[PDB]
Ligand SMILES: C[C@H](CS)C(=O)N1CCC[C@@H]1C(=O)O
């Protein structure tokens with residue numbers, strides 16, 4: 724029932740209810756001759772919404788806001804970008820123009836600036852050291868250490884037992900390590916271990932791309948990263 728990359732035209736966004744007050748948002752983009760999906764999260768924050776990650780670009784992110792307005796009808800007041808790549812910050816300007824307060828760690832903001840990407844307005848303190856966790860309304864933000872990127876955050880929704888791994892966690896169907904241009908391959912397995920150790924009760928695990936699963940996604944990611952590391 725989860726929207727697959729084939730069912731979503733580029734420019735459109737789907738919402739998927741994961742649990743009470745938790746949705747993923749799914750968008751797509753073409754890249755290098757293929758089409759890829761990308762997930763973010765929406766978490767009900769009382770009578771407001773907390774958005775995790777843009778929908779990968781300005782056009783998708785405008786479509787995301789329109790779909791949230793139509794399907795949920797609560798204002799998106801804050802957004803957190805979980806790393807500095809365009810599937811996480813691309814569209815921050817659209818959110819900002821819609822009155823959403825945009826947030827990211829100083830590490831993400833610094834890297835987004837280096838990359839020339841959009842830069843969230845606010846800085847999330849307390850996440851600079853591997854293993855650091857901070858509460859942000861209805862979620863916990865956790866910096867597990869460097870993995871897919873040096874700044875990657877994961878997001879846990881304690882009320883729903885939803886672990887959003889972002890692009891540090893791979894869906895089961897992914898056999899390669901994905902875009903490793905900014906990755907710390909040597910630290911990625913240890914960073915995954917920190918996630919496993921902190922959220923062993925997670926019932927839903929949402930990768931940054933593709934289908935949700937369970938905590939099995941973490942061991943799968945470890946295997947995929949190790950296979951990439953061992954490339955010959
Ligand atoms: C823009 C994102 C950032 S994780 C990216 O690097 N990639 C490569 C894999 C999926 C997505 C893409 O461009 O297809």
Ligand SMILES: [Zn+2]
Pocket residue numbers: 806808871872890902
């Ligand atoms: Zn990325």
Ligand SMILES: [Zn+2]
Pocket residue numbers: 761808810890931932
């Ligand atoms: Zn990604």
Ligand SMILES: [Zn+2]
Pocket residue numbers: 895942943944946
């Ligand atoms: Zn596997």
